[PDB]
Design a protein around this ligand. Sequence first.
Ligand code: N9M
Ligand code: N9J
Ligand code: CA
Ligand code: CA
Ligand code: ZN
Ligand code: ZN
Ligand code: ZN
Ligand code: ZN
Ligand code: ZN
Ligand code: ZN
Lengths: 227, 227
Amino acid sequence: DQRFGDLVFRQLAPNVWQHTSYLDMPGFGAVASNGLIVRDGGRVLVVDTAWTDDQTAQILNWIKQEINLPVALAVVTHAHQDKMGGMDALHAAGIATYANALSNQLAPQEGMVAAQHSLTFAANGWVEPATAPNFGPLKVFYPGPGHTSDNITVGIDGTDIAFGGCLIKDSKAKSLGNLGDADTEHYAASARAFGAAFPKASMIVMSHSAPDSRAAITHTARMADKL
Amino acid sequence: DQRFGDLVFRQLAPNVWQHTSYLDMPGFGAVASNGLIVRDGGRVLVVDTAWTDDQTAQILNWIKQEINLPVALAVVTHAHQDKMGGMDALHAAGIATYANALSNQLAPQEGMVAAQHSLTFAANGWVEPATAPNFGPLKVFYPGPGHTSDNITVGIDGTDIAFGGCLIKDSKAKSLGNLGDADTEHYAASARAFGAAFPKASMIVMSHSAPDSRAAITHTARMADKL
Ligand SMILES: *C(=O)ONC(=O)OCc1ccccc1
Ligand SMILES: O=C(NO)OCc1ccccc1
Ligand SMILES: [Ca+2]
Ligand SMILES: [Ca+2]
Ligand SMILES: [Zn+2]
Ligand SMILES: [Zn+2]
Ligand SMILES: [Zn+2]
Ligand SMILES: [Zn+2]
Ligand SMILES: [Zn+2]
Ligand SMILES: [Zn+2]
């Protein structure tokens, strides 16, 4: 709804905004990637960078203008350019960054800058609380390998919102996207584990489509069933 | 639906088949693209190549194997890889190729091989029939700039079928897809002009969706209005 530089920002809930940045892909044009911004009391929480450091500095600029609270931390949901391409801008701003330990391990070979802190997960997928200090309403869940081996998801406590990142596609999508890094054998179970971990969430936020209903989860799982 | 190598074919009408080829793209994965094959008495007409020369050779071998009538000509609907990627294959088979004069002018910078013959159009968008000799039931119409500046469309006289190529998306599509070369100002008008040129066609065939009703045209136009 709201333009700011080349970025776009839309409010989803009282204290929740989706940030959107675009990268030109050869032979297609502008590809959208979405993350989240969350106001928790007198601090801001960011889920995912933009594609670039410049775009990510613009997210911080927008936060300063529209919210005017410091950014306490950022969580990034896997080690790909659309989620972690802007890590340097976060670190330059003095923001504490968090990622799945596996994302941090993969980040060098994926061409990304690793986050400063590492999240680890229990066998049921939930983040170990000790690795995720003062995450406010952010509930962080590792659903298993799918889009990548490291992809994680975030629900926002007190809202109807759960963020699937690039794991989940919208209910009208045609493909699961590029399968180069994908765990085709476990994708279906991982999508359904995300759905089961946030069983009441009704607004499913994702990386490359506008928010959808839980049919996005069912349809994504249904596509993966065929792989 | 029948398979030959990497190609898939679906019979839409007694003398009309849809051909589908796939190109694996970074991020998007395997993207499907549809063209048409039309049996016109004792010869075959082809609308659009596959993504590559080898896939287009596969189309020609399936034609021989399954239909066993000579391919008299092909018409390609704009200068993009999924529509003109197999031009070299058609020329190697000695098939006469036709494209919008503008498509052949843009083809070199788009990385494509021009067709051997150029179609020109009247002020009302209809092809100048002297430049499309012996096209049989193919009625070629240039709707105006939209998906690209050069996109053209094809009706099959005597059927319920009209082919919008990449200009038209299906009635439930969430976006207009590949807009990197699009004419955002004129897109809605051109999509509607396509519908007015084939006023009775009930089966709308397109490049990146399964065949749909005329709702695909009106929905595509509404989405374009928003640009
Ligand atoms: C449109 O309804 O769906 N568009 C679409 O599938 O295009 C995807 C695409 C990606 C990259 C290059 C060409 C097409
Ligand atoms: O398939 C998707 N989104 O639905 O990948 C999006 C994308 C496109 C290009 C480059 C990275 C990521
Ligand atoms: Ca950097
Ligand atoms: Ca070639
Ligand atoms: Zn990714
Ligand atoms: Zn990779
Ligand atoms: Zn992504
Ligand atoms: Zn195109
Ligand atoms: Zn181009
Ligand atoms: Zn196309």
